[PDB]
Design a protein around this ligand. Structure first.
Ligand SMILES: [Cl-]
Ligand SMILES: [Zn+2]
Ligand SMILES: [Zn+2]
Length: 352
């Protein structure tokens, strides 16, 4: 019944896409002695239902509620999760289930990665961004005093269950910000994603339509294929060089997807001015993103503060900025240490 995308790492794991996946979760974890469901607050009820269905099969099943959103990835939260796994007596053969957006899958994933040096985790992402991106690929992380996105671990999930029923209650604004990673996947490796969205941009956002389920499958496949195929993975940062800087500048008060959207537009203008990307494919970034309702511009006077921010990013070595750029649709390449005047000119092409 559901579609499954296999992530061809070693060992491989499935990303299951379908409607009503609790049965598949039950049969998957039926034989574990203990399971802890780590969930964000608005999902207490789905978590309690998972817990009961599990306890029904004989699992000593627990739910662990963590703060919503970015508050949920903070070091004290993972400290709390560890203490709870201990109190419950979660062992090496036991399992965690994450239920929530990207922050939940990241913190629950980091906790599973480090508890007894690694226990199995199943991810149930409940946001579009979580489904196409954060839950696939095994990157986990937490927020510490050092900054965000710095501390983490690679830890592949036993499985990822992408339950489309859950999209029916997702607010429109979260749907739109999840679509920025789908669009990114389209530009880097699967232009059919772009063609499908262009047919009708508003049908792409409809959790009941037939387009969104296909876009999800395709975006997950692009990520699965990149991850299975050590630096090709950097292509997934497309739009994120400026995007992460904007987020930071706004103190994480902008949606991740909105910042990436502006970063994509910037990356396209950078490539266009460098002579690497044709005008048509370059312009297509702004037209697709703006048609979905995503921002395509940012504060015209922010470049100096953005440059200083990008200066300190982990990828920056000896003050040298690195960007993912396209040499054509689905032909990702790199631009290392671009001339400052070129960034200034690209930024003006985006903001003015
Ligand atoms: Cl979240
Ligand atoms: Zn999220
Ligand atoms: Zn992203």
């Amino acid at each position: 019944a559901p579609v499954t995308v296999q992530v061809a790492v070693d060992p491989p794991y499935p990303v299951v896409i379908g409607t009503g996946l609790l049965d598949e979760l039950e049969d998957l974890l039926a034989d574990r002695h203990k399971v802890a469901v780590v969930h964000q607050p608005g999902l207490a009820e789905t978590a309690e239902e998972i817990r009961k269905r599990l306890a029904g099969k004989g699992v000593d099943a627990h739910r662990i509620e963590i703060p919503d959103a970015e508050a949920g990835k903070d070091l004290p939260v993972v400290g709390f999760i560890w203490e709870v796994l201990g109190r419950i007596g979660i062992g090496r053969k036991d399992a965690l289930v994450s239920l929530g957006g990207g922050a939940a899958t990241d913190v629950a994933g980091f906790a599973a990665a480090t508890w007894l040096r690694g226990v199995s985790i199943v991810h149930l992402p409940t946001t579009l961004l979580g489904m196409v991106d954060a839950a696939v690929g095994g990157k986990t992380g937490i927020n510490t005093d050092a900054g965000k996105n710095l501390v983490g671990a690679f830890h592949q999930p036993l499985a990822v269950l992408v339950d489309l029923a859950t999209l029916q209650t997702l607010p429109r604004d979260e749907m739109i910000c999840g679509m920025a990673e789908v669009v990114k996947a389209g530009f880097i490796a699967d232009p059919v994603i772009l063609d499908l969205i262009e047919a009708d941009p508003q049908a792409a956002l409809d959790p009941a339509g037939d387009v969104l389920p296909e876009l999800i499958r395709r975006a997950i496949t692009v990520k699965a294929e990149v991850v299975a195929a050590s630096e090709l993975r950097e292509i997934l940062n497309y739009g994120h060089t400026l995007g992460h800087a904007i987020e930071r500048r706004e103190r994480y008060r902008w949606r991740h997807g909105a910042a990436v959207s502006v970063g994509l537009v910037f990356a396209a203008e950078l490539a266009r001015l460098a002579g690497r990307l044709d005008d048509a494919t370059a312009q297509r970034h702004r037209t697709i993103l703006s048609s979905l309702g995503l921002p395509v511009s940012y504060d015209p006077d922010a470049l100096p503060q953005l440059l200083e921010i990008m200066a300190g990013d982990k990828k920056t070595r000896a003050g040298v900025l690195r960007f993912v750029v396209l040499d054509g649709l689905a032909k990702p390449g790199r631009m290392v240490g671009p001339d400052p005047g070129l960034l200034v000119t690209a930024y003006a092409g985006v903001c003015a």
